[PDB]
């Protein structure tokens, strides 16, 4: 009984490994060997966005590529205007502890969450010229870590109870729950077609989920430690993950294979957040060594360093237009690079 | 939870697969096709730069 | 700039002023982080001074705010890396789970992101420990072989009126904890062992004095003295 | 030695 | 011999003090340290006081090494006005820093509401105003004049009032700040002394406090001692006297040279902030 | 939200009068206040503006030196004091709330106005005064002395519609964005010193007076006004 099930699982894993080994014919580095390198890119801090009285955990660019919403432990959800460094709104929260933030594609709503296990929704473009709680999404067991909006009424939230969920704003209860993870889920990322999304947990594995079916599709495991953050390739057939192993990993969906390893001998510090570019050539990442590094997605070479922070960086974000980059760190100031 | 894991592995077994070479070719095609559309990879003029 | 831009700048200035006022008001309170395990008197200690639970209290016109979260704390512990102190309670009476308590304390102390957060450590339920020592049913040497060769250090002067074996046991436990703390302390952050019981009411003064010493050390570091 | 400028600077008018 | 080594010594002191204060500028301005009472006090002292006095050092070394005043009439008053403005600013700011250290050591908790950065800025403004008030008369206490075939920027002021002004400068710039420093640090050391790491930290703090106090005492002692010797004793003119005057000027400048190093450039935290600049 | 103003009446020339406006349902402190005048037989003219927290107070050229404005946030009230008034100050007073940030909609709500009877500037031009017209597209053109386009790329002109016998409401801000509650039938475009407003499938309750108002720089100046008739 139990022995037969274990043998069947072992055989399934063995045939998965055989299929994985058979699909790997030539390394991506060997194919893109005759590709001109992007060279060294040096980006300076165009404007610093000061005004936070405590450390910062999250940030998300808007669709218009002008508004940032930064989540900080001072109990505020300041909304910054990137062009003029203007604070559009100041949102005091019930709970100071925060590790996630979101911005609606329409720009009308913001979402926040932390150790209170509740995803607060604030409506910006409304009457009485104020930002107020719209829905206090509750029902999670573990701490909330990453939220991303699909529409103005549909959310995907990752919590600390090794599960993800898709919630409906109007209804107020979970539309669908996603379970199967064994480790703490630390991040979440969406896709341009808004049909599939990838999530990273603390069990050294990333997993793809379908918003419609509500069941897992693919599970990739190539990391030795927890995956702190994940970003998804703009094309829609790949993504990138970052762990505490001081290495990033670019996986692809169509092949179900690990493609490249991103690591350097000098760095030992882990990855906090990763982000891609509009074209997808450059893969951004943030490390514990109080700076960021720009790495090429095809060469795995250090293209430049963004050492503008004092403490280790928390979040990195790229605008929809790809014009600029935002890095929010625990130094209480988030910097804009271009 | 052995049954759930077995069912998940069985469902994951039946998936169409594509060679890594073709996936890498598609990835580089995407990277090079929109290379002129990225303001950060290719430096932009100061006047044309909103930031 | 346009008139709309100037008005937006004025609004931003007012928002920044409100932010500064709120930050100044919030920074006046001293925040702590309470940790423990099962059969550890977190509830009795926190009620003595009375997803995430929080408490007020005040000592000598100084406000303290306490946070406790209700395994694998390696992730949410990153939130509390700017707090003034981490209180860690341990059940000194129970010997079965004392070793895993030592392991937990070692994981907390050597945590990479608590590299500058001092720890105030509480040996809760001292009367239960004294009763267990008096009974003699449970022996420390059964669990910790080094207790047999251990002796009470000189110049101790614990308190008036406890048996020498009780003092020996309590200082053996305290020496274990202090050795774990000072294995890689390097002087950036130190531990404050204390002997508290379930009925003791002077548990706020100990925390007040320990946090006072922590802030004194921080100020000494700030003036470049150390 | 005592330069005249130094002497006048130290002693003032005299 | 002496005419070759004297300008080199003055230039060396100028360079070392200026570069130390330049690192002080960099770390305390663009080093990431937020506004605070401690940071504000060392910022004021180092940057303003030390940079100003060290920039004004050559304008007084030219008295001994160029054998002629060539700075004009306005400079003859303004430069020395600045020099003694920084003298008083250094004295009052060191006294205030010692008082702040006592406040933060004796009362690490209750003083948190008192050591507000706004209050630190108010104290800096008050001490700067006091320094200006006590340094104002030196705009006329010196004057340029033509004696024989030489033009000299010399004291042009009556001796019965010059003696009184020198006494006032001695009592206010030196006596009160040194007394306040000594008493406050004595109280701090008494309170501190009533594991191995704690003992080492206390010993290091005591050593630093003692070296600061002895530094501020012994560096500004010789100049005022020479002035009092002039006005209450027979001071002859000899090569030994010239050497003693040069030594007094050198130690007076070395004071401001070594203030930023002793106060700031010795802590690991300060260099941790420095690492951001490079 | 509600904004109601009280005061006014028959007053002798040269006297002092107080107009008090009270607000409910919204944060008064965040919003900035505007006092504007409507002559009984003429168009709208701006009078005064006060920012959030009374940080900046701006007055019109005509009323400079004899008009004062104040606001009491805890009481959620706005006071206007008038001294040495003239015979030309007899008009209807309108109080307007305006919020100022990126993507905001200034002049979104107009309070109920009062009536007072007494015993350089950028010029707005409206070529059409009365245009006969339901169900037919209507185009209204407004011209400015100088281009209303700043370096940042933001254009500053607002279109206001006046119903017969009550407060105006905003239709189009920045000549492109549509205010909340405005039907999609309204549209706006324009270029340097020439702005156009287009209405398609005109229906009932669209009769009113159209004003084009420039907000690039103070003082605010309103359009002459275009009347639409059946």
Q: How far apart are CA F26 and CA F171, in angstroms?
A: 21
What sign does the CA torsion over C148, C149, C153, C154 have?
A: positive
| F188 to chain C, closest Cα gap in Å | 20
Whether C8 and chain F come into contact, CB under 8 Å, resolves to yes
Q: How far apart are CA E211 and CA E213, in angstroms?
A: 6
Sheet holding A118-123: strands in order across? A100-103, A109-113, A118-123, A132-138
Residue entry with tokens 């050597």: C110
Q: In which element (H, E) is residue A139 found?
A: none
Task: Indicate the pairing of strand F44-50 with strand F57-59.
Answer: antiparallel
Full DSSP string of A31-81: HSTTS---------EEEEE---SS-EEEEEE-TTSSEEEEEETTSB--EEE
What sign does the CA torsion over A132, A138, A142, A145 have?
A: negative
Q: What is the CB neighbour count within 10 angstroms for residue A77?
A: 23
CA distances from A29 to A33, A252, A261, B24, F141 (A): 6, 15, 10, 10, 62
Selected from 2.130.10.10, 3.30.465.10, 3.30.9.10, 3.30.300.30, the CATH number assigned to the domain covering A1-337 reads: 2.130.10.10
Report yes or no: E95 and E180 within 8 Å, Cβ to Cβ.
yes
- Closest Cα in chain A to F25: A128
Token pair of F39, please? 């002559």
What's the DSSP call for residue A109? E
Q: In which element (H, E) is residue A222 found?
A: none
Bridge partner list, A76 = A92
| E274 to chain C, closest Cα gap in Å | 13
Angle at F55 between CA F54 and CA F56, to 5 degrees: 95
Q: Using CB atoms within 10 A of its CB, is residue A23 exposed (0-12), middle (13-18) or buried (19+)? A: middle
Burial E229-244 (b: 16+ CB within 10 A, else e): eeeeeebeeeeeebee
Chain-centre distance for alpha carbon C162? 26
Number of domains within chain C: 1
Where in chain F are the domains? 2-118, 124-228
- Closest Cα in chain D to E158: D13
Q: How far apart are CA C207 and CA F224, in angstroms?
A: 73
Across the interface, do E152 and D5 touch by the CB < 8 Å criterion?
yes
Token pair of E52, please? 């100003």
**Among candidate residues A131, A142, A137, A181, the one with its CA nearest the CA of residue A156:** A137
- Closest Cα in chain E to A331: E32
| B48 to chain A, closest Cα gap in Å | 11
Across the interface, do E197 and C185 touch by the CB < 8 Å criterion?
yes
Token pair of F189, please? 């475009």
- Provide CB contacts within 8 A for E165, sequence distance 6+: E137, E141, E157
Residue entry with tokens 């275009």: F226
Residue entry with tokens 């104290």: E123
Token pair of C139, please? 């022996």
Report yes or no: C52 and A97 within 8 Å, Cβ to Cβ.
yes
* Domain of residue C137, CATH code: 3.40.50.300
Token pair of C158, please? 């614990």
| Facing D12 at nearest CB: one of E64, E148, E157 | E157
In CATH, the number for domain F2-118 is: 2.60.40.10
Whether C205 and chain F come into contact, CB under 8 Å, resolves to no
> What's the reported resolution, in angstroms, to a tenth?
3.5
Mapping DSSP to helix (H, G, I), strand (E, B) and coil, where does residue F26 land?
coil
**Among candidate residues A284, A276, A270, A273, the one with its CA nearest the CA of residue A314:** A273
| Facing A143 at nearest CB: one of C27, C74, C76 | C76
Q: Using CB atoms within 10 A of its CB, is residue F11 exposed (0-12), middle (13-18) or buried (19+)? A: middle
Report yes or no: A95 and A137 within 8 Å, Cβ to Cβ.
no
- Closest Cα in chain B to A41: B41
The three state secondary structure string of chain C is CCHHHHHHHHHHHHHHHHHHHHHHHHHCCEEEEEECCCCCCHHHHHHHCCCEEEEEEEECCEEEEEEEECCCCCCHHHCCCCCCEEEEEEECCCCCCHHHHHHHHHHHHCCHHHCCCEEEEEEECHHHHHHHHHHCCCCHHHHCHHHCCCCCCCCCCCCCCCCHHHHHHHHHHHHHHHHHHHCCCCCCCCEEEEECCCCCCCHHHHHHHHHHHHHHHHHHHHCCCC
Token pair of A240, please? 């990138």
Chains that touch B (3 or more CB pairs under 8 A): A
Q: How far apart are CA F70 and CA F68, in angstroms?
A: 7
What sign does the CA torsion over E203, E204, E207, E209 have?
A: negative
Where in chain A are the domains? 1-337
Whether E112 and chain C come into contact, CB under 8 Å, resolves to yes
**Among candidate residues A181, A272, A170, A180, the one with its CA nearest the CA of residue A229:** A272
| Facing C10 at nearest CB: one of F56, F156, F216 | F56
Mapping DSSP to helix (H, G, I), strand (E, B) and coil, where does residue A86 land?
strand
| Facing A279 at nearest CB: one of B10, B17, B37 | B37
Across the interface, do A115 and C8 touch by the CB < 8 Å criterion?
no
Q: How far apart are CA A331 and CA A56, in angstroms?
A: 8
Across the interface, do A130 and F1 touch by the CB < 8 Å criterion?
no
**Technique behind the model:** cryo-EM
* F130 φ, ψ (degrees, to nearest 5): -125, 125
Q: Using CB atoms within 10 A of its CB, is residue A35 exposed (0-12), middle (13-18) or buried (19+)? A: middle
Across the interface, do A235 and B30 touch by the CB < 8 Å criterion?
yes
Q: How far apart are CA A239 and CA E2, in angstroms?
A: 74
Q: How far apart are CA A169 and CA A165, in angstroms?
A: 13
| E16 to chain D, closest Cα gap in Å | 26
| B1 to chain A, closest Cα gap in Å | 10
**Taking chain F, what is the end-to-end CA distance rounded to the nearest angstrom?**
33
What's the DSSP call for residue F110? E
Report yes or no: F33 and F97 within 8 Å, Cβ to Cβ.
yes
**Among candidate residues E142, E153, E169, the one with its CA nearest the CA of residue E223:** E169
Residue entry with tokens 């700048």: C9
Backbone dihedral region for residue A190 (phi beyond 0: left; psi -120 to 50: alpha; all else: beta): beta
CA distances from C74 to A115, A204, C68, C88, E269 (A): 14, 15, 15, 16, 27
CA distances from A153 to A105, A137, A139, A150, C10 (A): 11, 12, 17, 8, 34
Q: Virtual CA dihedral for A145, A149, A152, A154, nearest 10 degrees?
A: -80
Full DSSP string of F39-91: -TTS-EEEEEEE-GGG--EEE-STTTTTEEEEEETTTTEEEEEE-S--GGG-E
Instruction: Tell me which residues of chain C have a C-beta less than 8 Å from any C-beta of chain A.
Output: 5, 8-9, 11-12, 15-16, 18-20, 22-23, 26-27, 51-52, 69, 72, 74-76, 79, 81-82
Chain-centre distance for alpha carbon E83? 10
Q: How far apart are CA E20 and CA E263, in angstroms?
A: 11
Expressed as residue numbers, the domain containing C163 is: 3-223
* F139 φ, ψ (degrees, to nearest 5): -115, 130
Token pair of A37, please? 């390198």
Bridge partner list, F72 = F77
- Closest Cα in chain C to A314: C78
Burial F150-180 (b: 16+ CB within 10 A, else e): beeeebbbbbbbbeeeebbbbbbbbbeebbe
Q: How far apart are CA A154 and CA A167, in angstroms?
A: 6
Which residues of chain A are within 8 Å of residue F27 when distances are taken between CB atoms?
128-130
Is C touching F (3+ C-beta pairs, cut-off 8 A)? yes
Q: How far apart are CA C141 and CA E20, in angstroms?
A: 60
Across the interface, do C11 and F215 touch by the CB < 8 Å criterion?
no
* CATH architecture for segment(s) F124-228: Sandwich (2.60)
Which residues of chain A are within 8 Å of residue C31 when distances are taken between CB atoms?
none
Token pair of F105, please? 């909609």
């Amino acid at each position: 009984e139990l022995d037969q099930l274990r043998q069947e699982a072992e055989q399934l894993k063995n045939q998965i490994r055989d299929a994985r080994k058979a699909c790997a014919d030539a390394t991506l580095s060997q194919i893109t060997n005759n590709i001109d390198p992007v060279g060294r890119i040096q980006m300076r801090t165009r404007r610093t966005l000061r005004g936070h009285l405590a450390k910062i955990y999250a940030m998300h660019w808007g669709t218009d590529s002008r508004l940032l919403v930064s989540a900080s432990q001072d109990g505020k959800l300041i909304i910054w205007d990137s062009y003029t460094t203007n604070k559009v709104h100041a949102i005091p929260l019930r709970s100071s502890w925060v590790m996630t933030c979101a911005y609606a594609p329409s720009g009308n709503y913001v979402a926040c969450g932390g150790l209170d296990n509740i995803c607060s929704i604030y409506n910006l473009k409304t009457r009485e010229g104020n930002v107020r709680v719209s829905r206090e999404l509750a029902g999670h067991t573990g701490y909330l870590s990453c939220c991303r909006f699909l529409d103005d009424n549909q959310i995907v939230t990752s919590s600390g109870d090794t599960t993800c969920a898709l919630w409906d704003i109007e209804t107020g209860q979970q539309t669908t729950t996603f379970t199967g993870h064994t480790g703490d889920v630390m991040s979440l990322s969406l896709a341009p077609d808004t049909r599939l999304f990838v999530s990273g947990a603390c069990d050294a594995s990333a997993k793809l989920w379908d918003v419609r079916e509500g069941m897992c599709r693919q599970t990739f495991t190539g990391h030795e430690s927890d995956i702190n953050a994940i970003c998804f390739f703009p094309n829609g057939n790949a993504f990138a993950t970052g762990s505490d192993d001081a290495t990033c990993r670019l996986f692809d969906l169509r092949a179900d294979q690990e493609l490249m390893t991103y690591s350097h001998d000098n760095i030992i510090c882990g990855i906090t957040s990763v982000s891609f570019s509009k074209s997808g050539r450059l893969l951004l990442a943030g490390y514990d060594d109080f700076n960021c590094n720009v790495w090429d997605a095809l060469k795995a070479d250090r293209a430049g360093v963004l050492a503008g922070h004092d403490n280790r960086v928390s979040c990195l974000g790229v605008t929809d237009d790809g014009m600029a980059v935002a890095t929010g760190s625990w130094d209480s100031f988030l910097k804009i690079w271009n | 939870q052995a049954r759930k894991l077995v069912e998940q592995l069985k469902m994951e077994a039946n998936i169409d697969r594509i060679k890594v070479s073709k996936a890498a070719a598609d990835l580089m095609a995407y990277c090079e096709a929109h290379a002129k559309e990225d303001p950060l990879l290719t430096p932009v003029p100061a006047s044309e730069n909103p930031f | 700039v346009s008139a709309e831009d100037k008005a937006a700048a004025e609004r931003s200035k007012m928002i920044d002023k409100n932010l500064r006022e709120d930050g100044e008001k919030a920074r006046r309170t001293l925040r702590l982080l309470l940790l423990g395990a099962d059969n550890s008197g977190k509830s009795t200690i926190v009620k003595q001074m009375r997803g995430i639970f929080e408490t007020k209290f005040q000592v000598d016109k100084v406000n303290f705010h306490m946070f406790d979260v209700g395994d694998e704390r390696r992730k949410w512990i990153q939130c509390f890396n700017d707090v003034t102190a981490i209180i860690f309670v341990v059940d000194s009476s129970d010997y079965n789970r004392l070793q895993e308590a030592l392991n937990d304390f070692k994981s907390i102390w050597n945590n990479r992101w608590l590299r500058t957060i001092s720890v105030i450590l509480f040996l809760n339920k001292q009367d239960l420990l004294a009763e267990k020592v008096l009974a003699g049913k449970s022996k420390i040497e059964d669990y910790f072989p080094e207790f047999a060769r251990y002796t009470t250090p000189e110049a101790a002067t614990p308190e008036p009126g406890d048996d020498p074996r009780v003092t020996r046991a309590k200082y053996f436990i305290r020496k274990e904890f202090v050795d774990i703390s000072t294995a890689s302390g390097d002087g950036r952050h130190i531990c404050y062992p204390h002997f508290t019981c379930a009925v003791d009411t002077e548990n706020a003064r100990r925390i007040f004095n320990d946090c006072k010493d922590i802030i004194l050390q921080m100020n000494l570091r700030e003036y470049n003295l150390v | 030695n005592w330069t005249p400028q130094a002497m006048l600077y130290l002693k003032g008018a005299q | 011999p002496e005419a070759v080594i004297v300008p080199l010594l003055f230039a060396l002191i100028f360079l070392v003090g200026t570069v130390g204060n330049t690192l002080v500028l960099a770390v305390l301005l663009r080093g990431g340290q937020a506004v605070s009472t401690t940071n504000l006090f060392i910022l004021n002292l180092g940057v303003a006081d030390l940079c100003f006095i060290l920039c004004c050092v050559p304008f007084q070394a030219t008295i001994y090494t160029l054998d002629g005043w060539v700075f004009g009439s306005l400079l003859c008053k303004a430069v020395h006005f600045l020099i003694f403005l920084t003298m008083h600013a250094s004295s009052f700011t060191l006294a205030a820093v010692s008082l702040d250290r006592y406040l933060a050591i004796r009362y690490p908790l209750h003083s948190r509401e008192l050591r507000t950065p706004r209050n630190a800025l108010a104290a800096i403004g008050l001490i700067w105003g006091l320094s200006l008030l006590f340094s104002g008369p030196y705009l006329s206490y010196y004057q340029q004049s033509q004696l024989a075939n030489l033009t000299v920027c010399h004291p042009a002021w009556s001796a019965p009032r010059r003696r009184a002004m020198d006494i006032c400068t001695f009592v206010f710039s030196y006596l009160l700040p040194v007394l306040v420093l000594g008493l406050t640090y004595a109280r701090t050391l008494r309170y501190l002394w009533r594991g191995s790491g704690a003992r080492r930290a206390k010993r290091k703090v005591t050593r630093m406090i003692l070296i600061v106090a002895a530094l501020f005492c012994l560096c500004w002692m010789p100049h005022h001692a020479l002035i009092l010797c002039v006005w209450f004793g027979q001071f002859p003119l000899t090569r030994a006297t010239y050497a003693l005057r040069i030594l007094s000027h050198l130690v007076s400048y070395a004071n401001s040279c070594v203030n930023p190093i002793v106060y700031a450039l010795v802590s690991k935290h300060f260099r941790k902030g420095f690492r951001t600049i490079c | 939200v509600q904004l109601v103003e009280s005061g006014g009446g028959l007053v002798q020339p040269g006297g002092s009068r107080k107009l008090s406006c009270s607000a409910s349902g919204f944060a008064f402190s965040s919003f900035g206040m505007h006092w504007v005048r409507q002559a009984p037989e003429k168009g709208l003219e701006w009078v005064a503006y006060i920012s959030s927290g009374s940080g900046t107070i701006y007055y019109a050229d005509t009323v400079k030196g004899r008009f004062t404005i104040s606001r009491d946030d805890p009481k959620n009230t706005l006071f206007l004091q008038m001294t040495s008034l003239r015979s030309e100050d007899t008009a209807m007073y309108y109080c307007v709330r305006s919020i100022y940030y990126y993507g905001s909609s200034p002049f979104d709500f107009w309070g109920q106005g009062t009536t007072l009877t007494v015993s350089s500037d950028i010029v707005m031009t409206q070529a059409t005064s009365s245009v006969p017209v339901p169900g037919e597209s209507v185009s209204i053109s407004c011209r400015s002395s100088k281009s209303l386009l700043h370096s940042n790329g933001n254009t500053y002109l607002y279109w206001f519609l006046q119903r017969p016998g009550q407060s105006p409401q905003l239709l189009i801000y920045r000549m492109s964005n549509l205010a909340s509650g405005v039907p999609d039938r309204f549209s706006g475009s324009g270029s340097g010193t020439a702005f156009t407003l287009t209405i398609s499938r005109l229906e009932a309750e669209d009769v009113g007076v159209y004003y084009c108002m420039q907000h690039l720089e103070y003082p605010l100046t309103f359009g002459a006004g275009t009347k639409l008739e059946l």
